[PDB]
Design a protein around this motif. Structure first.
Motif, PDB file in Angstrom:
ATOM      1  N   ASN A  25       0.839  -1.225   0.000  1.00 22.28           N
ATOM      2  CA  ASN A  25       0.000   0.000   0.000  1.00 22.28           C
ATOM      3  C   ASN A  25       0.860   1.256   0.000  1.00 22.28           C
ATOM      4  OD1 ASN A  25      -2.795  -0.268  -0.243  1.00 22.28           O
ATOM      5  ND2 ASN A  25      -3.002  -1.045   1.852  1.00 22.28           N
ATOM      6  N   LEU A  26       1.393   1.599  -1.163  1.00 18.13           N
ATOM      7  CA  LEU A  26       2.229   2.782  -1.294  1.00 18.13           C
ATOM      8  C   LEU A  26       1.402   3.973  -1.757  1.00 18.13           C
ATOM      9  CD1 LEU A  26       2.084   2.484  -4.436  1.00 18.13           C
ATOM     10  CD2 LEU A  26       4.250   1.257  -4.254  1.00 18.13           C
ATOM     11  N   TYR A  27       0.099   3.757  -1.881  1.00 18.25           N
ATOM     12  CA  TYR A  27      -0.813   4.801  -2.325  1.00 18.25           C
ATOM     13  C   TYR A  27      -1.592   5.392  -1.158  1.00 18.25           C
ATOM     14  CZ  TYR A  27      -1.364   5.931  -7.275  1.00 18.25           C
ATOM     15  OH  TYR A  27      -1.235   6.473  -8.531  1.00 18.25           O
ATOM     16  N   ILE A  28      -1.646   4.657  -0.052  1.00 18.27           N
ATOM     17  CA  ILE A  28      -2.366   5.113   1.132  1.00 18.27           C
ATOM     18  C   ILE A  28      -1.796   6.432   1.642  1.00 18.27           C
ATOM     19  CG2 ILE A  28      -3.074   4.557   3.485  1.00 18.27           C
ATOM     20  CD1 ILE A  28      -4.319   2.812   1.280  1.00 18.27           C
ATOM     21  N   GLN A  29      -0.486   6.457   1.863  1.00 20.13           N
ATOM     22  CA  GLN A  29       0.183   7.660   2.343  1.00 20.13           C
ATOM     23  C   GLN A  29       0.234   8.715   1.243  1.00 20.13           C
ATOM     24  OE1 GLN A  29       3.641   4.792   2.922  1.00 20.13           O
ATOM     25  NE2 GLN A  29       4.747   6.681   2.428  1.00 20.13           N
ATOM     26  N   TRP A  30      -0.266   8.347   0.069  1.00 15.64           N
ATOM     27  CA  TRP A  30      -0.298   9.245  -1.078  1.00 15.64           C
ATOM     28  C   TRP A  30      -1.691   9.850  -1.237  1.00 15.64           C
ATOM     29  CZ3 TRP A  30      -3.282   8.962  -5.506  1.00 15.64           C
ATOM     30  CH2 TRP A  30      -2.930   9.824  -6.552  1.00 15.64           C
ATOM     31  N   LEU A  31      -2.692   9.155  -0.703  1.00 14.30           N
ATOM     32  CA  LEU A  31      -4.076   9.613  -0.775  1.00 14.30           C
ATOM     33  C   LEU A  31      -4.395  10.578   0.362  1.00 14.30           C
ATOM     34  CD1 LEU A  31      -5.908   6.302  -1.724  1.00 14.30           C
ATOM     35  CD2 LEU A  31      -5.701   8.356  -3.129  1.00 14.30           C
ATOM     36  N   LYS A  32      -3.687  10.424   1.476  1.00 10.18           N
ATOM     37  CA  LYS A  32      -3.900  11.273   2.643  1.00 10.18           C
ATOM     38  C   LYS A  32      -3.143  12.590   2.518  1.00 10.18           C
ATOM     39  CE  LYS A  32      -2.035   8.433   5.759  1.00 10.18           C
ATOM     40  NZ  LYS A  32      -3.394   8.609   6.341  1.00 10.18           N
TER      41      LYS A  32
END
Length: 20
Positions: A1-8
């Motif tokens: 999940n390298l997009y989670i910290q990218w969505l926040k």
């Protein structure tokens, strides 16, 4: 999940162009 910290962070708006 390298997009989670990218969505926040604001996705591509206040983050970076849709990466991998």
């Amino acid at each position: 999940n390298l997009y989670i910290q990218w969505l926040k962070d604001x996705g591509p708006s206040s983050g970076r162009p849709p990466p991998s």
